Point group: C2
Chain length 276, copies 2
């Protein structure tokens, strides 16, 4: 009932393109402090990619005596992996504050002044070079993306985000997955239930028993890639050239990981087609 938990964590992490390899690390008999550090590292990466908007909280995950993995924010028990992925998404929901574009409204640094996102590159240079902590608001970035930047202590953070809901991603991963099926009326009656209802709807109505009870386990229904944070440290975190390069890097990686998680999703969705 709490077994297959390392693998459950690994699958959650995969929806963010994080090959956390936690199961393998436990099979190698790694010490529990090691597993704890690895769980936390992966979760913080995933948090960099999920786009939920919670950089102002501390994200940890840790083993419990009863074989569970406990996820926490600012140290408060938020959820347990055994309670399922929908339960985790529900745990995060009240701590979010998304605007109309889906972008987070919270300041990464917390309460305080936020410089504009459109700032002239010379002004931003002065902030990078000579300020202590600082933070810009969202600005448009390229190809329907948005970007921002902030420095906490010794580390500069460059975030690039293109919000995209998880439901839609699932339905398009089911577009490819159905697309690979017999040209037949299962299709035409999914597609004619596309001019009437969402695609989990038409695919839970046109399928057989356990389509919903099976799919209610997928983490990809609650989590998907929407941003990418590239970090810099030390002298680089006060160098404007490094920041410009890091922005290029974060946009590139956004493209990459969106593609990669799409591929892994359609693959395992197609693994469910062979099983059927």
């Amino acid at each position: 009932q709490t077994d297959g938990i390392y693998a459950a964590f690994d699958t959650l992490m995969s929806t963010a393109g994080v090959d956390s390899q936690i199961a393998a690390l436990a099979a190698s008999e790694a010490d529990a402090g090691t597993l704890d550090a690895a769980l936390t590292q992966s979760l913080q990466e995933a948090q960099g990619r999920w786009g939920l908007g919670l950089h102002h909280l501390r994200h940890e995950a840790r083993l419990t005596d009863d074989g569970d993995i406990e996820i926490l924010t600012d140290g408060r028990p938020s959820a347990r992996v055994s309670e399922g992925f929908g339960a985790l998404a529900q745990a995060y929901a009240p701590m979010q504050a998304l605007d109309e574009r889906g972008l987070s409204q919270w300041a990464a640094l917390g309460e305080g002044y936020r410089a504009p996102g459109d700032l002239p590159l010379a002004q931003l240079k002065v902030l990078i070079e000579h300020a202590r902590d600082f933070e810009t608001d969202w600005s448009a970035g390229r190809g329907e993306t948005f970007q921002r930047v902030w420095r906490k202590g010794d580390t500069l953070f460059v975030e690039v985000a293109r919000p995209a809901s998880a439901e839609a991603a699932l339905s398009k991963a089911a577009w490819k997955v159905i697309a690979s099926i017999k040209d037949r009326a299962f299709q035409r009656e999914l597609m004619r239930r596309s001019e009437k209802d969402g695609m989990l709807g038409a695919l839970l109505g046109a399928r057989h028993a356990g389509a919903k009870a099976n799919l209610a386990q997928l983490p990809e229904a609650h989590f998907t890639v929407q941003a990418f944070v590239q970090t810099l440290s030390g002298a680089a975190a006060r160098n404007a050239e490094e920041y410009r390069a890091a922005l290029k890097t974060a946009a590139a990686a956004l493209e990459e990981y969106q593609g990669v998680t799409t591929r892994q999703l359609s693959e395992v969705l197609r693994h469910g087609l062979r099983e059927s």
Copy 2:
């Protein structure tokens, strides 16, 4: 001490140009708790002006159960008023770090990055308008002053300093009083004794023996107005014109308080030699 612990504190406070009025407050119909608060407000004001360079510490002053005034840095007892002013100066001294010019090497914001103090004013403007907490190193300013600036939260702190030891200030007041002497014979002897053992030397000389006694118990021997801090809040704290105005204001306030305490010291050294 002399005529009370509240008198003793007011006399200290006068060294920094703070008319703290604690003796009057204690003799009044004020609410209970009003005195400790007065003491701490006056003390922090004073710290902005003595130039000891301790902005990173929290200063407080509070009554004790045996009727004394205790002075604290970061909650720790440092000294008590009745122990005398030399003792207070010596409690501060090991906390201080003054470079050759007399200026604090301590950041006001503590450990971290400091911008240069000769920064181009357009860059400094970007910091005032868009950064959060930040701080600059000392630089020169108008009229042999030095200046630095920093933001803590919603307040911008502009400091202007013209270091001068309590000894140098005593020497300037001794010079002043040796000038205004009406009797010329005494003045010829004083000026000879001063071509020899300096100005205050001669001056304390001509008094009755033990001249250096008594005055050495005055606080003027251990604290003197060396600097001034002007504060801005709200929108003004993010306005670079306000910054430049605030600098002129703090420079004027400093030249005033130094002229003042020079006059008051010149009165100290006059009411013990004229009656000779």
